[PDB]
Amino acid sequence: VFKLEINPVTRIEGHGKITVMLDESGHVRETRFHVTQYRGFEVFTHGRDFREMPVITPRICGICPVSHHLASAKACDEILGVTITPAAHKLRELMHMGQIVQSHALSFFHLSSPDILWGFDAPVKIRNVAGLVDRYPELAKKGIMLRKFGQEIIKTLGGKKIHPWHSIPGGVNRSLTPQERDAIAAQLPEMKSIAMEAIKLIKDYLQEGGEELKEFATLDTAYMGLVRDGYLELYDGEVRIKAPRGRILDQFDPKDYLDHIGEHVEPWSYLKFPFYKALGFPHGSYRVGPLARLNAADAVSTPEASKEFALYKEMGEDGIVPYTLYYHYARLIEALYGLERIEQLLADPDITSSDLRVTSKEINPEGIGVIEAPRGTLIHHYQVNESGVITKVNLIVATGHNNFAMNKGVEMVAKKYITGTNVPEGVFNRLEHVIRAYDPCLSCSTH
Amino acid sequence: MKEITLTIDGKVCKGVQGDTILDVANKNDVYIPTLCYQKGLTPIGACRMCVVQLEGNPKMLPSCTTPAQDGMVVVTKNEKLKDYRRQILELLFAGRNHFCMYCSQSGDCELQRLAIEHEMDSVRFPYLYEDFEVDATDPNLMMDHNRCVLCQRCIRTCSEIVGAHTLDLERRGWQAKVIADLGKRLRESDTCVNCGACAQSCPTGTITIREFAYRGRRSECDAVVESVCPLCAVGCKIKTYVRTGSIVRVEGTGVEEPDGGQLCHMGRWWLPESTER
Amino acid sequence: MAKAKVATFWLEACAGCHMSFLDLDERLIDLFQNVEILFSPIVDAKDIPNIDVGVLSGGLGNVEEVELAKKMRERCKYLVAWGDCAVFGGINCMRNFIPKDVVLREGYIETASTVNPQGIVPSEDIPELLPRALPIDYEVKVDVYVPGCPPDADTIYYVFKELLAGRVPKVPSEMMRYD
Amino acid sequence: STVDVVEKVKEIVAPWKGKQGGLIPILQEVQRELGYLPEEALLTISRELKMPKAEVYGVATFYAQFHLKPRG
Ligand code: SF4
Ligand code: SF4
Ligand code: SF4
Ligand code: SF4
Ligand code: SF4
Ligand code: FCO
Ligand code: FES
Ligand code: 3NI
């Protein structure tokens, strides 16, 4: 007859609200996860020039502004019909790797580590980064330093840490110099050591409470990712959706997304529900993010991340791990990959190059930019006129894809741990950790 | 005499009997806030930011239009003047819609610099949210009227310096607007030569050259070199701005010569477009 | 036992200002030894306690943010506005030229990739968008303004050290930026 | 007809060519004989007096007596 509301969900980005509806006998029958913010970036961007979009769109989120920057840059690039210099490609990929590193470090160390180290039943006042630096100071400063590495890469490339500006329509504005290149390269060993320490921590956490942590909000769905020929790619590539059992279903090209993805609207959330169109809703809904990426990708291109990708693949069947709480693990793998990817970019003598712009005089009516933000796939779609004025905007961001998975996981833990009324603050914390495993950027979702 | 002397900020300054106070101030080094003043154009008197008062006389005089007369003491900085100038800036911000986050001139705008120098951190006024037209019909120049101070330096540059009298003021009052010929968009106007003298004269980010947006900020350049435009025989003096091995902005030095700094479409479009070939 | 009671939140922000708070990397560790952080987007407190310094980010777009700003105002003595979204209104005010109905409709019905032949707009269990997005100096009384998008880490740290030393600071003109 | 107003305002600007002033009386008399100032009238006034279109539109929209659209 009554309701439980955890709003506002804490230690996540954005404004969320979990609502469980209990029946007369005191049992869970329905549970929802509402996103309670909206600004209208798809609407108030009309009439602006397209070259203005790589600066407006980063204001969607401050955890992943580089992702929106790069997607807008790609969309304007396809509006100009330019194919960017190899150097600009590498610098954009370096900035994307910095963003991946910083976002995963933030989402593991500052937002979810208390529930990994102290458990879901720790006191409330100590379950935060303050209590963490109080009791586990080395780990807190390690995560802080990793995020510093990522954001200082973003700063040396794009002037600022939050909302940087590096990517113009046509290419890239700045290049690295030998001094700052070596200054970045000399910092990679301790960052790899921090990533391996975190991987150790999460692996022991998952093996300790082994199987109960495998049923925590686990639901078999499809997995979407970006892939090169067969490899995990975060900047370019094709979109690949894998059925819940390994079979590849509709691997396509990013610009052909209106033929494959559709968004269903529900009255209780400003967040939409994207789904594969050929299977409808809510059957075509899939997962995005580190877990879905490592499930859809077949191999990786860096040694020490492959040595752990193998151990990750031998955790589930068919090269597929459906467990929600393994997201953390997968996330760290990506961070590791990111670091190693930087070590391949800094070693290329076209990072300190000078040919970075491909300027053209041509305005095409459509431009689509699809990249791999840390939490999943990010699609920008701009439609302009012949004057270069924005006529239509369409965004589909990462956490939005994971909305159905979050709802189902929250409902599962709701009618698994809620016994009746008088619910302690250890059952609500699990109702929030099922959301925190996906680490949602609720500002990205409701752009 | 043709040789007068004043005292601005206690500092004794020299000048000629024909000039204004702002000219005597700029002649030595002395600083006075200005937004509608442009070297090479007849003083207008619109922003009222150059206000200045003398000892004894409680009136406030616009330093850019009032002549200099030997024996007068000039005060540029005090509590009253700071308050009035901050109120003018807050009016300008609350009237129009200034979004510095994505402005192309968000680091080299005269209004923004005047607001930061006066420590503006609130507007104190109800923020009239009016709908102003953004004209991006011309592929090269953009006019975003959300950022207009109505200094008229664009209407004075296309009239006395260029001759292509394409710009003027529409309906009077608060509904004042800078229009093209007969209220048309810039692309429909036939009396435009696409010289960009208006973009160089605009102090805010209303008129903007589109293809070099966010790159042609004079504040984030690497070097400034002055040379001559090779394309034609006139040989206009330029002020090339270089950023990462690329020309991002070409501005016309020579606001004292009869050309007035207006360069042709070639001089300020092809030259920065040439460095990216 | 002599710790302050800083409590922060975001109303209609993009998390950018709180992420610029979080990049005070070593300054964060040496600040936590001088500040205990009650209700905040990075702690698990659900309701605002009685505090000393209250920090708000973002503007006012929903009917929930207004009440939350009023709560943070009543519960503190020194309020700090973070970012242009709270000080000037910021990018949210880009939707104050289109009616709320048109915003919601063209964002949930008219966009491509959207499939709802019913014509549903999100209108249940969630707060309703205000007719206009406004700064926080419309419903509360701000003490310290920190403009930017987002403010630099040095500015946030300066304001913190000044407020925890006992003086109400004003952002100096050599470090003020509207971005 | 849009062709009638051309010559009809030609005959109103005739007594004013090369007289250094008198533009608001021209507009006043085109308002008296048409009730409003159409775009064709303003274009022809600009072409006859060789005064820029921006100037004539600025002075036509400065005063409340004039009207740029047909009045009720
Ligand atoms: S014109 Fe100047 S004050 Fe106005 S938004 Fe642009 S940078 Fe800010
Ligand atoms: S481009 Fe030249 S002619 Fe056209 S409005 Fe600007 S200054 Fe006048
Ligand atoms: S467009 Fe620029 S120069 Fe012209 S009136 Fe407006 S602010 Fe002044
Ligand atoms: S700017 Fe134009 S007019 Fe001047 S010298 Fe160069 S080509 Fe000739
Ligand atoms: S001012 Fe900028 S960084 Fe701060 S909340 Fe608003 S959009 Fe985000
Ligand atoms: N992560 C993230 Fe933001 C989201 N979702 C992007 O891109
Ligand atoms: S600058 Fe002196 S009045 Fe405009
Ligand atoms: Ni995000």
Side-chain angles (χ1 to χ4, degrees), chain A, chain B, chain C, chain D residues 2-72:
Chain A
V1 297
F2 67 113
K3 198 166 328 306
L4 300 180
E5 304 82 9
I6 307 180
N7 107 126
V9 179
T10 64
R11 271 157 50 205
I12 80 179
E13 188 262 28
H15 295 253
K17 180 175 57 177
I18 310 165
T19 80
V20 202
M21 252 77 47
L22 296 152
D23 65 3
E24 300 79 4
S25 324
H27 280 176
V28 174
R29 73 143 170 90
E30 181 137 310
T31 308
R32 302 166 152 153
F33 172 63
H34 321 260
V35 189
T36 45
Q37 54 170 336
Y38 184 50
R39 297 173 275 166
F41 275 87
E42 300 160 335
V43 181
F44 66 60
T45 40
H46 294 190
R48 306 309 309 192
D49 172 44
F50 75 89
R51 320 199 171 84
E52 294 211 8
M53 291 298 286
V55 184
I56 302 184
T57 42
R59 267 83 197 174
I60 285 174
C61 174
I63 311 198
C64 32
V66 171
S67 312
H68 297 266
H69 190 41
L70 288 179
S72 265
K74 295 175 73 164
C76 304
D77 271 343
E78 316 218 10
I79 287 164
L80 284 183
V82 295
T83 302
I84 56 176
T85 58
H89 187 113
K90 290 176 200 53
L91 293 151
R92 289 185 179 183
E93 202 163 17
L94 189 67
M95 204 169 67
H96 195 70
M97 290 316 112
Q99 204 259 297
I100 290 262
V101 166
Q102 75 109 351
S103 267
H104 289 166
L106 175 95
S107 66
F108 172 81
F109 281 106
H110 302 66
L111 291 193
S112 99
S113 180
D115 301 352
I116 300 201
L117 287 178
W118 299 121
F120 309 111
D121 41 359
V124 164
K125 314 153 320 301
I126 216 68
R127 228 173 34 225
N128 44 59
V129 82
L132 182 82
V133 64
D134 280 347
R135 312 160 83 82
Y136 279 88
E138 27 269 37
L139 204 75
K141 64 172 39 93
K142 281 180 182 180
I144 270 177
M145 262 333 285
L146 188 65
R147 191 170 183 270
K148 195 178 187 303
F149 180 76
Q151 259 169 347
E152 256 85 325
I153 293 177
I154 299 178
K155 200 212 182 182
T156 183
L157 273 171
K160 302 165 59 183
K161 295 195 179 189
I162 312 299
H163 303 140
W165 178 78
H166 188 219
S167 323
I168 47 194
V172 123
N173 178 270
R174 212 191 167 278
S175 158
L176 273 184
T177 78
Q179 264 303 5
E180 43 185 359
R181 179 195 58 179
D182 310 329
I184 290 185
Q187 256 180 342
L188 279 148
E190 46 277 353
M191 300 330 169
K192 298 192 282 191
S193 316
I194 285 171
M196 297 286 297
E197 241 273 349
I199 274 175
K200 184 108 52 151
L201 195 142
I202 191 62
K203 274 169 81 68
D204 299 282
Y205 166 65
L206 300 173
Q207 187 203 180
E208 184 43 76
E211 193 268 5
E212 179 261 282
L213 287 194
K214 274 179 194 176
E215 312 140 318
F216 200 97
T218 286
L219 52 142
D220 314 1
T221 63
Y223 305 106
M224 174 196 268
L226 249 57
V227 278
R228 274 216 341 268
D229 45 346
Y231 287 88
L232 177 80
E233 184 45 79
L234 292 167
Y235 175 74
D236 253 28
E238 335 172 297
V239 182
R240 166 187 286 194
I241 311 167
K242 276 203 171 173
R245 276 308 252 138
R247 173 179 46 245
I248 289 97
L249 169 111
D250 210 78
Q251 161 171 320
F252 59 102
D253 189 282
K255 65 168 210 173
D256 319 315
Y257 85 98
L258 273 199
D259 314 348
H260 298 294
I261 298 166
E263 281 175 335
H264 176 74
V265 177
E266 292 275 46
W268 67 82
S269 210
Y270 284 126
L271 187 35
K272 304 188 204 166
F273 295 75
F275 60 91
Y276 185 58
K277 241 187 249 199
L279 274 71
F281 181 86
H283 294 289
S285 296
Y286 44 83
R287 267 147 134 180
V288 297
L291 190 92
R293 282 208 278 277
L294 286 192
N295 287 324
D298 272 48
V300 274
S301 298
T302 65
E304 249 305 300
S306 159
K307 260 184 257 175
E308 263 284 333
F309 177 90
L311 296 161
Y312 166 94
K313 284 304 215 176
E314 55 156 338
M315 282 183 148
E317 317 319 290
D318 264 298
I320 288 207
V321 202
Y323 318 130
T324 291
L325 251 59
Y326 277 48
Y327 254 87
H328 302 336
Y329 187 26
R331 161 166 315 118
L332 297 178
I333 298 300
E334 306 304 271
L336 200 38
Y337 172 78
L339 296 170
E340 301 162 11
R341 189 61 154 113
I342 292 169
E343 318 200 355
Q344 309 178 343
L345 285 187
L346 293 179
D348 191 343
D350 309 308
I351 272 275
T352 75
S353 161
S354 270
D355 284 287
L356 318 168
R357 284 157 294 244
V358 191
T359 185
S360 159
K361 320 300 155 304
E362 149 189 341
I363 289 187
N364 305 328
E366 203 174 39
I368 301 180
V370 176
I371 61 163
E372 215 54 41
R375 251 69 79 179
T377 311
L378 166 65
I379 306 174
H380 286 227
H381 179 205
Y382 303 146
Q383 277 187 350
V384 301
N385 53 32
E386 38 279 348
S387 315
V389 202
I390 273 282
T391 70
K392 256 204 72 83
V393 180
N394 183 45
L395 307 165
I396 302 195
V397 198
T399 282
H401 299 273
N402 278 328
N403 201 9
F404 191 77
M406 292 200 276
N407 277 18
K408 298 298 290 314
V410 172
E411 203 155 359
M412 291 177 57
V413 284
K415 54 191 158 194
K416 181 142 190 342
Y417 291 76
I418 283 182
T419 90
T421 327
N422 191 180
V423 285
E425 64 276 80
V427 176
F428 280 161
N429 194 93
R430 301 174 205 245
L431 281 177
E432 317 177 11
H433 201 76
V434 44
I435 301 286
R436 294 209 275 273
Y438 303 90
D439 271 309
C441 272
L442 294 188
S443 322
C444 286
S445 326
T446 67
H447 24 78
Chain B
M1 294 297 298
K2 296 182 60 180
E3 184 55 46
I4 48 174
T5 193
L6 319 182
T7 121
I8 309 185
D9 274 8
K11 178 190 183 177
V12 281
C13 329
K14 320 279 298 174
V16 173
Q17 178 62 341
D19 47 39
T20 61
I21 284 176
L22 186 66
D23 291 278
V24 190
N26 295 359
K27 218 150 70 170
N28 303 79
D29 57 27
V30 179
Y31 178 81
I32 284 175
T34 50
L35 190 51
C36 55
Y37 176 76
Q38 179 169 4
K39 176 176 252 62
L41 282 181
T42 301
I44 313 176
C47 69
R48 313 303 288 178
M49 283 285 301
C50 71
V51 276
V52 116
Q53 75 186 20
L54 325 177
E55 271 73 353
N57 190 15
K59 215 192 271 323
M60 305 216 323
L61 312 167
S63 64
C64 55
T65 70
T66 64
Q69 315 247 358
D70 212 317
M72 58 168 45
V73 274
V74 177
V75 203
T76 75
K77 323 172 319 213
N78 54 331
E79 275 333 303
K80 214 227 280 182
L81 281 177
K82 257 218 61 184
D83 203 340
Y84 285 175
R85 293 178 188 148
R86 189 165 172 173
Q87 282 193 256
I88 299 171
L89 295 160
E90 289 180 4
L91 289 172
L92 279 174
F93 271 97
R96 306 260 161 161
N97 313 111
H98 296 275
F99 299 117
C100 289
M101 40 269 307
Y102 70 90
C103 191
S104 298
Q105 306 303 124
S106 100
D108 56 332
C109 171
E110 288 286 321
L111 181 68
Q112 188 197 45
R113 190 187 52 81
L114 278 167
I116 291 183
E117 189 175 50
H118 287 266
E119 312 183 309
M120 195 208 98
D121 47 8
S122 39
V123 293
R124 291 211 256 88
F125 301 124
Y127 257 140
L128 293 144
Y129 290 116
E130 193 41 37
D131 203 348
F132 299 102
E133 41 214 90
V134 43
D135 184 19
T137 320
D138 186 22
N140 315 297
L141 271 177
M142 193 189 208
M143 309 202 30
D144 182 5
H145 299 268
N146 293 105
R147 307 152 183 174
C148 215
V149 144
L150 250 9
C151 39
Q152 291 169 46
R153 269 162 74 168
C154 34
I155 321 188
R156 298 288 191 89
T157 182
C158 230
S159 293
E160 314 166 0
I161 296 185
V162 171
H165 197 301
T166 319
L167 310 172
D168 206 338
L169 274 188
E170 203 195 0
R171 302 125 187 287
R172 58 130 180 267
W174 189 78
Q175 279 87 22
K177 223 187 71 62
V178 169
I179 48 142
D181 314 327
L182 285 177
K184 296 311 179 300
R185 274 68 193 269
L186 204 56
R187 207 211 227 172
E188 336 192 356
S189 101
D190 49 353
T191 73
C192 194
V193 298
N194 293 0
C195 51
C198 43
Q200 169 169 344
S201 289
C202 211
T204 51
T206 305
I207 313 172
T208 326
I209 313 178
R210 276 175 65 167
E211 72 282 350
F212 301 113
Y214 297 117
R215 276 164 45 66
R217 284 154 165 185
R218 328 183 191 92
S219 35
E220 45 185 23
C221 75
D222 309 46
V224 197
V225 202
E226 319 187 350
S227 100
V228 197
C229 167
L231 302 160
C232 83
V234 179
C236 304
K237 303 179 180 301
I238 67 187
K239 202 179 185 63
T240 324
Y241 293 91
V242 177
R243 175 179 203 189
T244 82
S246 210
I247 295 170
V248 289
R249 208 178 199 90
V250 186
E251 295 257 81
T253 320
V255 278
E256 292 297 42
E257 320 307 323
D259 51 2
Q262 51 142 321
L263 307 175
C264 39
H265 184 269
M266 311 187 266
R268 81 160 78 243
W269 266 277
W270 293 6
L271 297 200
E273 276 185 350
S274 159
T275 311
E276 328 145 309
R277 282 201 209 162
Chain C
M1 61 105 217
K3 296 276 205 66
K5 285 165 172 293
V6 162
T8 75
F9 215 60
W10 47 38
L11 309 167
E12 193 92 270
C14 59
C17 302
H18 288 257
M19 286 324 129
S20 100
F21 172 49
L22 273 168
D23 74 358
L24 290 163
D25 300 37
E26 301 80 0
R27 303 175 272 178
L28 227 59
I29 297 146
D30 65 28
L31 180 104
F32 287 146
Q33 265 305 355
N34 293 125
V35 176
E36 81 200 357
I37 292 183
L38 318 177
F39 171 87
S40 154
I42 66 176
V43 303
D44 256 27
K46 293 294 173 296
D47 288 7
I48 309 202
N50 256 20
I51 51 169
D52 311 299
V53 183
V55 166
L56 277 173
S57 192
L60 309 170
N62 309 351
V63 294
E64 208 298 289
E65 288 92 278
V66 176
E67 319 301 321
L68 217 168
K70 286 174 182 172
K71 270 192 193 60
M72 187 144 270
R73 176 65 259 188
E74 306 175 39
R75 260 75 163 98
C76 77
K77 52 193 307 297
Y78 291 148
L79 201 73
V80 175
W82 273 358
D84 297 336
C85 286
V87 169
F88 300 132
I91 212 156
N92 317 354
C93 296
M94 283 225 64
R95 74 159 177 92
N96 301 3
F97 320 124
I98 299 154
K100 175 220 314 200
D101 283 28
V102 180
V103 175
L104 270 195
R105 179 175 325 274
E106 180 225 291
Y108 286 91
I109 298 172
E110 261 59 32
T111 66
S113 204
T114 304
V115 284
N116 56 338
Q118 284 263 270
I120 309 150
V121 304
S123 42
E124 84 174 12
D125 190 274
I126 53 189
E128 188 42 54
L129 264 54
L130 282 187
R132 274 176 181 175
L134 316 163
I136 75 176
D137 209 8
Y138 269 62
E139 306 322 294
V140 304
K141 188 253 181 182
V142 185
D143 303 76
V144 189
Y145 294 85
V146 187
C149 188
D152 203 68
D154 314 332
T155 317
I156 291 186
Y157 193 42
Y158 168 89
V159 169
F160 264 178
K161 314 161 42 55
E162 289 296 270
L163 271 186
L164 313 156
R167 28 204 198 268
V168 197
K170 265 142 53 45
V171 184
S173 151
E174 66 258 64
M175 71 172 35
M176 193 188 301
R177 271 119 174 92
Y178 307 153
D179 278 318
Chain D
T2 79
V3 72
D4 157 274
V5 277
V6 170
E7 35 250 49
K8 190 244 169 43
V9 189
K10 282 171 158 47
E11 316 306 289
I12 309 179
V13 191
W16 280 109
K17 284 192 198 181
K19 318 299 307 320
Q20 179 237 49
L23 176 84
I24 94 177
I26 290 196
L27 285 185
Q28 265 161 329
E29 253 187 21
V30 191
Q31 174 101 336
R32 277 225 304 107
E33 277 67 89
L34 292 170
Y36 74 121
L37 302 180
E39 184 275 330
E40 272 307 345
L42 291 199
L43 186 35
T44 69
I45 292 178
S46 87
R47 205 164 12 245
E48 294 188 295
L49 284 190
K50 270 171 248 204
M51 169 162 346
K53 299 143 77 174
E55 306 263 49
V56 50
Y57 194 99
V59 63
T61 38
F62 178 67
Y63 296 108
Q65 279 36 51
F66 307 144
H67 302 89
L68 258 281
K69 318 193 291 313
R71 245 308 195 187

